[PDB]
């Protein structure tokens with residue numbers, strides 16, 4: 001049980017996504033971009049990603065580790081910077097704040113998971 005629990009990341013990521021869903025800054029990133037309505041999005045973005053897809057992928061058990069989840073969430077933010085490159089866009093600003101919040105909170109989820117990993121690999 002809980003010391004170096006290698007499953008704990010799952011619940012912690014579910015909680016973090018819940019917080020993200022609550023932030024007004026996530027509003028543009030909650031659902032896939034409507035690709036039949038916003039035409040050039042796919043001209044610019046190779047692999048769309050959004051927080052509802054991340055939440056569903058976690059709920060389905062299809063993330064092997066919190067590093068996989070982290071990769072998808074990072075893709076949301078890199079996509080925004082590619083599609084909305086301008087520092088004066090308020091949407092650029094939203095993405096930037098929300099990314100900082102995510103990176104702050106995911107930090108301990110990753111180090112705890114890796115700690116656990118190195119513990120059980122050692123013993």
Ligand SMILES: COc1cccc(OC)c1CNC(C)=O
Nearest residue numbers: 028029033038041080083084091
């Ligand atoms: C097609 O992209 C659009 C279209 C309208 C508004 C808008 O910003 C709310 C965006 C940018 N959305 C993302 C997720 O990059």
